[PDB]
Design a binder for this molecule. Structure first.
Ligand SMILES: CC(C)(COP(=O)(O)OP(=O)(O)OC[C@H]1O[C@@H](n2cnc3c(N)ncnc32)[C@H](O)[C@@H]1OP(=O)(O)O)[C@@H](O)C(=O)NCCC(=O)NCCS
Length: 358
């Protein structure tokens, strides 16, 4: 019992995807402490209209003003589960809504979306059903762990430059000014919690959001949010083509799911400076590959994701927070399933299970 991932199997009409609604939010602070409020939310603040063009030094402060998170801490769903626990009696959708939902991180859904096109990076998703609700929690594969531990210095600095770009583009207050003189602390995060539905699969998920744009067309979340990215400056049509085919797919999937309608890219030169900014509206990203023989197709992404959710729901029959069905996938193969109990794979903590049980 496995699930094939070839795009041709999923090339039908675009499935139903509910306009996402923000149910709430939470923040993680510089010490990675949870707070049930928007204190981590920053505000889109691009270069002044009359000033010079961007020249953001993304290397500035690396590494002496860099406070990296501890990647050996496995948080799994814990922060989202705290939000759910604290809001379980205030969820919309009527009685039993949560029991019919699938609960996960936005990025887990992103990896499902891009699976039909992914050629390098496999994944593992642990699944447990508990009080009807299906929970999906990513497991770091042994190969991803090894590449994390052997991360080249170049790639470590590139992760910093991404975070640093937000420091140049966002302010602590609406209409305020950025202040890049501080530290880059990757514990800090603002997370939007969303309701959606894909096909007949209700979803509750959360995703980190870079900033709110007081100038957005719509002021209500998630339509007012902006996702920030960096990418190498491109100079040839072939370079742009490769960017549309590979990078844009991931940018699209990540922001389509939570309803974030704009991705703003800082293009960086080889010396590490952002010299150019470009806005990519999420619902226009596919236009760049719509007539491309080697392009991606959002219908394939969403139809595979729906097929996986159906596959996971029908595979995880037993309601048991200590039981895990592990869905494993590597490029060139189907999604396969193995069954595990308790540690290490079981991921729903007793502080969640016990409260929900009572
Ligand atoms: C809080 C969190 C869980 C929210 O999840 P999410 O929104 O679903 O995560 P996404 O994968 O979509 O990533 C969104 C952002 O989180 C941040 N982030 C994600 N993984 C990160 C890491 N390993 N280190 C630092 N920051 C990270 C980045 O700012 C990223 O933005 P980008 O896509 O522009 O790079 C996520 O930010 C996070 O911390 N993920 C780390 C998970 C992890 O390390 N798992 C272990 C391997 S399985």
């Amino acid at each position: 019992p496995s699930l094939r991932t070839q795009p041709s199997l999923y090339s039908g009409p675009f499935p139903f995807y509910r306009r996402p609604s923000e149910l709430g939010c939470f923040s993680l602070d510089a010490q990675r402490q949870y707070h049930g409020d928007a204190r981590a939310l920053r505000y889109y603040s691009p270069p002044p209209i009359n000033g010079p063009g961007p020249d953001f030094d993304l290397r500035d402060g690396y590494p002496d003003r860099y406070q990296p998170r501890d990647e050996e801490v496995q948080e799994r769903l814990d922060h989202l589960l705290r939000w759910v626990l604290e809001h379980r009696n205030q969820l919309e959708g009527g009685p039993g809504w949560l029991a019919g939902a699938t609960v996960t991180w936005r990025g887990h859904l992103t990896k499902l979306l891009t699976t039909p096109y992914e050629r390098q990076e496999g994944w593992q998703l642990a699944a447990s059903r508990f009080q009807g609700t299906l929970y999906l929690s990513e497991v770091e594969t042994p190969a991803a762990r090894a590449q994390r531990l052997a991360r080249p210095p170049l790639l470590r600095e590139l992760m910093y430059m991404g975070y640093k770009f937000s420091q140049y583009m966002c302010a602590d207050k609406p209409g305020g000014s950025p202040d890049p003189s501080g530290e880059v602390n990757t514990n800090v995060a603002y997370c939007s919690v969303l309701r959606s539905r894909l096909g007949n699969h209700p979803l509750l998920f959360s995703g980190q959001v870079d900033c709110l744009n007081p100038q957005a067309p719509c002021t209500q979340p998630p339509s007012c949010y902006v996702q920030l990215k960096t990418s190498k400056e491109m100079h040839s049509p072939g370079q742009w083509r490769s960017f549309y085919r590979h990078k844009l797919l991931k940018w699209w999937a990540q922001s389509f799911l939570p309803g974030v309608p704009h991705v703003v890219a800082g293009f960086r030169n080889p010396e590490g400076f952002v010299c150019s900014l470009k806005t990519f509206p999420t619902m226009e990203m596919f236009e760049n590959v719509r007539n491309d023989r080697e392009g991606w197709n959002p219908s394939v992404c969403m139809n595979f994701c729906a097929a996986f959710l159906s596959f996971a729901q029908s595979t995880v029959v037993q309601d048991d927070p200590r039981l895990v069905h592990l869905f494993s996938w590597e490029p060139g193969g189907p999604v396969t399933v193995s069954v595990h109990r308790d540690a290490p794979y079981a991921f729903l903590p007793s502080w969640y299970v016990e409260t929900m049980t009572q």
